[PDB]
């Protein structure tokens, strides 16, 4: 396929750096790109992904990609993603995400940024998913990803990978997963009964430390006993294994 670089205003330095790396490639001035009126099924390099030019080509249905994608794939045509949406860079190439327990609109934002960073997205948790994005613990997707020890990260991981990769070229491992891991008890309100005052204080502390809420029936999500009624072994195993445990396995 042909490659048409679209010179535009507001572009980053990576656009220029992509021109210094190239005959079947055309270099279009902004005006020549504004006079396009159809979709020639060629690859268009655009930078930025804002402005009347980019939205024009996008409206026509053109295959659009950022210069970071060029610096990533270089002369490999097969390396270029093959999708109906513009890909800005390849920060998330090889990442396949699914989401769980998120607001639908946030979910679709996540999907958007992942796809724009060269990643894949599925709505179910299939065997291709490499990362689970979660807004809180406890879901079927969550427990499954835990049992397989797949990373379960917060949405911010995607956001921080977008915002940062706007300026520089990077990959998804260039951020520490641990700093964006879903806390073991995020979304949980932990309540206790029949525990020594000391153990009680321990549950309080560890709950707050692992992203949960402590409250000393409508407010509780879990009830530690000597709503989910679980033994303390559920709490300690959740902390020890690094994931909220399946409560039905601790009844």
């Amino acid at each position: 396929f042909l490659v048409k670089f679209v010179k535009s205003s507001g572009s980053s330095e990576y656009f220029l750096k992509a021109l210094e790396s190239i005959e079947h490639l055309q270099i279009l001035e902004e005006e020549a790109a504004l006079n396009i009126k159809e979709n020639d099924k060629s690859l268009y390099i655009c930078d930025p992904f804002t402005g009347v030019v980019f939205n024009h080509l996008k409206k026509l249905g053109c295959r659009i990609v950022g210069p970071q994608v060029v610096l990533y794939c270089m002369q490999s045509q097969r390396c270029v993603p093959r999708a109906e949406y513009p890909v800005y860079n390849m920060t998330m190439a090889d990442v396949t995400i699914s989401c769980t327990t998120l607001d639908k609109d946030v979910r679709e934002e996540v999907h958007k940024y992942v796809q724009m960073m060269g990643g894949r997205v599925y709505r179910d948790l299939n065997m291709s998913v490499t990362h689970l994005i979660a807004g809180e613990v406890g879901s079927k997707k969550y427990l499954v990803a835990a049992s397989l020890k797949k990373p379960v990260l917060l949405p911010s991981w995607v956001k921080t990978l977008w915002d940062k990769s706007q300026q520089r070229m990077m990959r998804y491992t260039d951020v520490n997963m641990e700093d964006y891991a879903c806390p073991v008890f995020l979304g949980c309100t932990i309540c206790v009964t029949g525990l020594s005052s000391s153990d009680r204080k321990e549950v309080q502390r560890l709950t707050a430390e692992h992203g949960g809420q402590y409250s000393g029936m409508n407010e509780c999500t879990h009830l530690i006993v000597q709503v989910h009624c679980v033994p303390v072994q559920w709490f300690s195993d959740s902390i020890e294994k690094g994931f909220c445990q399946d409560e039905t396995m601790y009844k």
Binding site: D124, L125, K140, V144
Partner: peptide, 8 residues
């Protein structure tokens, strides 16, 4: 199947 957990 390839689906381990379905969409919510």
């Amino acid at each position: 199947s390839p689906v381990l957990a379905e969409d919510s």
